[PDB]
Amino acid sequence: PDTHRADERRFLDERGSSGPLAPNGLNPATIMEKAVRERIVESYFWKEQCFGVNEADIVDRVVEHVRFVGGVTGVTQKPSPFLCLAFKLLQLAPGDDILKEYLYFGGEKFKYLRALAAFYIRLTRPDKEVYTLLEPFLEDRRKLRRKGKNGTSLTYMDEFIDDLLTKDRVCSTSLWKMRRRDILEDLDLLEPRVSPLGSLEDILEEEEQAAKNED
């Protein structure tokens, strides 16, 4: 009595023939590399915690099980629960409402949920939309753990977002190549990014004022 295994097997073994595409025009099943897909579906966490899960279950699993951001680590090539849940999100293909909830409301309560949502958005969304959605969270300064060679190292949400926005490979996953932000700006699709701090000149003026006055 297990339709779940059948559905998963169907998704993994072939897609795009009977697969709805991501908003960026990619096929969700092939967004992550085949090798990594193998490492995930074979993994214990996938088999015991991702089996037949739901979008609600996604939040529950994130709170319960993810303690860091990472791809595949160690000699055994174990995929992080974070990565596995990302792959599951690729499977579930959640809509804008669910992503909105995860990111803003869930993200406010659970930082790793925001990290997951941001990752998924970078994976599945058009470049302009990705910049517009993710750039505000450069103001999110909450601490995150990232999986290193032994244990974990410290990073921050704004650093993770910046990585998503500026790097080709994140969490053992190749991110679809994007038009650079300056290209979008040149094409008038995007205005230049506005920092919460303001312009560099403004920062210089405030700095000079703070220095001149006694402090």
Partner 1 sequence: MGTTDDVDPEAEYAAWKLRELRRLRRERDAIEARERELAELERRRNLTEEERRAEDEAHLAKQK
Residues that bind partner 1 (CB under 8 A): 67, 111, 138-139, 141-145, 151-152, 154, 156, 158-159, 162, 182, 192-193, 195-197, 200, 203
Smallest distance from the beta carbon of 142 to partner 1, in angstroms? 5
Q: Closer CB to partner 1, residue 47 or residue 143?
A: 143
By beta-carbon proximity to partner 1, the closer residue of 21 and 154 is: 154
104 or 156: CB nearest partner 1: 156
Nearer to partner 1, 4 or 193 (CB): 193
- Give the shortest CB-182-to-partner 1 separation in angstroms: 7
Residue 77 in tokens:
């090539």
Tell me whether residue 16 or residue 148 sits nearer to partner 1 (CB atom).
148
Shortest distance (Å) from residue 168 CB to partner 1: 17
Nearest-approach distance from CB 151 to partner 1, in angstroms: 6
